[PDB]
Amino acid sequence: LLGWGLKQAEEANKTPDKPDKVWRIQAGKGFNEFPNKEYDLYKSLLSSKIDGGWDWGNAATHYWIKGGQWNKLEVDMKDAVGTYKLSGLRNFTGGDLDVNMQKATLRLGQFNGNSFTSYKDSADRTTRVDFNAKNILIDNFLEINNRVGSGAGRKASSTVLTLQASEGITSSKNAEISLYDGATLNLASNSVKLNGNVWMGRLQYVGAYLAPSYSTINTSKVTGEVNFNHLTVGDHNAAQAGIIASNKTHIGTLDLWQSAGLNIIAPPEGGYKQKTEVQPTQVIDGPFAGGKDTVVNIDRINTKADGTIKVGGFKASLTTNAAHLNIGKGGVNLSNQASGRTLLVENLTGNITVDGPLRVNNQVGGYALAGSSANFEFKAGVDTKNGTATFNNDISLGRFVNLKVDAHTANFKGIDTGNGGFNTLDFSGVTNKVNINKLITASTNVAVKNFNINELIVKTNGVSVGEYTHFSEDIGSQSRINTVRLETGTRSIFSGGVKFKSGEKLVIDEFYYSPWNYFDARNIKNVEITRKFASSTPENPWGTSKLMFNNLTLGQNAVMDYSQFSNLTIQGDFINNQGTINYLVRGGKVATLNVGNAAAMMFNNDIDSATGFYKPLIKINSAQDLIKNTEHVLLKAKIIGYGNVSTGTNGISNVNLEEQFKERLALYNNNNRMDTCVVRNTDDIKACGMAIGNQSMVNNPDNYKYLIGKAWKNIGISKTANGSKISVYYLGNSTPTENGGNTTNLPTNT
Numbered sequence: 124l125l126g127w128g129l130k131q132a133e134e135a136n137k138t139p140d141k142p143d144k145v146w147r148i149q150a151g152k153g154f155n156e157f158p159n160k161e162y163d164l165y166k167s168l169l170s171s172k173i174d175g176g177w178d179w180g181n182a183a184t185h186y187w188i189k190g191g192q193w194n195k196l197e198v199d200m201k202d203a204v205g206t207y208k209l210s211g212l213r214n215f216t217g218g219d220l221d222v223n224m225q226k227a228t229l230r231l232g233q234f235n236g237n238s239f240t241s242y243k244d245s246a247d248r249t250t251r252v253d254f255n256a257k258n259i260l261i262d263n264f265l266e267i268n269n270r271v272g273s274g275a276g277r278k279a280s281s282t283v284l285t286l287q288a289s290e291g292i293t294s295s296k297n298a299e300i301s302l303y304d305g306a307t308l309n310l311a312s313n314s315v316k317l318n319g320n321v322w323m324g325r326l327q328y329v330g331a332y333l334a335p336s337y338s339t340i341n342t343s344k345v346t347g348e349v350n351f352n353h354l355t356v357g358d359h360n361a362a363q364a365g366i367i368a369s370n371k372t373h374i375g376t377l378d379l380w381q382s383a384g385l386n387i388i389a390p391p392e393g394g395y396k397q398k399t400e401v402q403p404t405q406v407i408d409g410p411f412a413g414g415k416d417t418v419v420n421i422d423r424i425n426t427k428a429d430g431t432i433k434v435g436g437f438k439a440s441l442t443t444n445a446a447h448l449n450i451g452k453g454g455v456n457l458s459n460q461a462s463g464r465t466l467l468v469e470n471l472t473g474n475i476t477v478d479g480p481l482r483v484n485n486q487v488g489g490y491a492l493a494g495s496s497a498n499f500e501f502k503a504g505v506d507t508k509n510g511t512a513t514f515n516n517d518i519s520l521g522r523f524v525n526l527k528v529d530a531h532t533a534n535f536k537g538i539d540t541g542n543g544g545f546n547t548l549d550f551s552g553v554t555n556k557v558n559i560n561k562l563i564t565a566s567t568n569v570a571v572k573n574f575n576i577n578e579l580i581v582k583t584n585g586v587s588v589g590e591y592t593h594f595s596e597d598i599g600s601q602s603r604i605n606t607v608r609l610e611t612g613t614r615s616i617f618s619g620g621v622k623f624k625s626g627e628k629l630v631i632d633e634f635y636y637s638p639w640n641y642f643d644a645r646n647i648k649n650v651e652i653t654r655k656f657a658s659s660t661p662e663n664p665w666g667t668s669k670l671m672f673n674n675l676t677l678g679q680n681a682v683m684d685y686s687q688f689s690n691l692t693i694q695g696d697f698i699n700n701q702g703t704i705n706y707l708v709r710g711g712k713v714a715t716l717n718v719g720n721a722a723a724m725m726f727n728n729d730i731d732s733a734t735g736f737y738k739p740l741i742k743i744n745s746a747q748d749l750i751k752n753t754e755h756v757l758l759k760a761k762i763i764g765y766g767n768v769s770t771g772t773n774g775i776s777n778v779n780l781e782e783q784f785k786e787r788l789a790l791y792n793n794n795n796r797m798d799t800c801v802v803r804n805t806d807d808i809k810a811c812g813m814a815i816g817n818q819s820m821v822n823n824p825d826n827y828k829y830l831i832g833k834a835w836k837n838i839g840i841s842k843t844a845n846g847s848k849i850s851v852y853y854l855g856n857s858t859p860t861e862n863g864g865n866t867t868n869l870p871t872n873t
Contacts, residue, residue, distance in 0.1 A: 232263025
């Protein structure tokens, strides 16, 4: 119940023991003159002062030093040369070796393993087994603080094993190091490279599923290259392992258990370092911050998961204070039983950089059942609050999976929740930015306070109801979406859709319509559109599209393609800047634009080189089937406040603003304008006569000289520009007179 940080800081600063009968052995002649001999260390040297035996009560074998388990043994070689091996010292209870072997290769396994254990006396002693070899070469299994026989008899207290090579501590492929509830392991070589299954935390007794089971591997002294290969924490219990690393730790596959933790600790910035009886000072450390150049390179994180069904999950977790935490191309697996398993890749004072696909039950899609909420969870820079959580690989989420990221800046490359649904894609802990690249949703519960998702596909979700993309908190004022693209829904019913809850502005740049999917824009008051705004099928749409807004404001050059197939509902002040709304008829009818409150429209002298005239402010294409002598409602309004960037038009003047509004509108037919016809040469007279349907100018283009440097309105088309209505009165496609009227000049603002 203490947790690992208390237990390690309590086991770190201890006096070794008080041993009586400190035996001493010095290797004399014979050893220091054969550099290749391949000795044996127990039988030729150590067996003088270590006796075997049997423990009455659960034995296989038994070992101690001499006269009980409270007797220190030194071995002082310091010049012996060869290769030594232990090869079978099993269930050593003993206490306080230190085999001192400079220039002597060791080998802790040959055809048989080793073990180093203590016994729970009334003194609760450790064993402090040390080695000081040149190479070590584990080469078969070694278990630290094991069970001696089977359960009964005397119990096992903590222990410490120290390995202190000066050239490397390697391991064979089948050499399973496995250290248990009290066990630690100090390494002090350079270039530790354990190629075998290191196993921190393991069932010490056969049924004790509720043991605490701490463990520690302290590779702090390693001046070289720490390199594990297959770390495996926890076995059917809630183990809390820990590694005190040395600011570069490449490990291979990591296999957490359901409820097993891990505390990889980087070094600090500058590196490490009757009668009243006063105990010595117990220095104890809280969670500090690693140095600048601390890296922890895990390359795969699996999770082994079977067993019970608890009221929650079990929350596998790992915790790091390094300045970086890279996760390699293997990605993240998560095995999921009936309840919802949970992973916490937490980083206290650093970053997180995942470079692999998030799997669950070892595939990329990875469905789950209803209660089984497979919950990924990432924490980048909790205690310094300036840590990014970059995902450089395209993640994909299936069904009942819930990513959440609580970082400073959560970059992404693409999130695809469109397959499964029911995804609580939380980001509420993110301080400012969430830079998603491409989001695909079906029924999601996105919670972002500030983002720029610069591409957004919104899928539908079949035929079910009550499921929709749902932004569940305040969008704020700095948000942005550079592309929304809805896709076509299902037949005759709104299954999918998007709705918001709060926020005030959302600078959308591009959009597409879709039949039977709704972009509900609840409670946001400045839904901005900056460029092109059309349908996903721009040639021939169909169906219904509830674009249930509450306000919008449209900037420069943003073409709209308003149709009868998208009831674009506005409850606020539709503010139109220099943006050309286009129309289409679909049977001669004109869909009105229902402004709720006010339609302020502000423009300028948008003179171009394409025409020489003002840019076409409102376009109505294909008005051939437009019903003549009939009011066509173009937009319902309440306040039309027109203006320019100055008081008067064409520079500065005192011209009223409502009359030139009929000049900039357009009625587009025969790939030309039936409203007016601004002419600068003789060739456009052909297309102009084809637009007005008159051959009287076609065969004789230069016969008419009222149109060079001039313009003319076709009379018989009337447009209202009063304070509350803009309408269409198509009543005549008249032939323009020569010198009678209905003619204007060029704008000429160049």
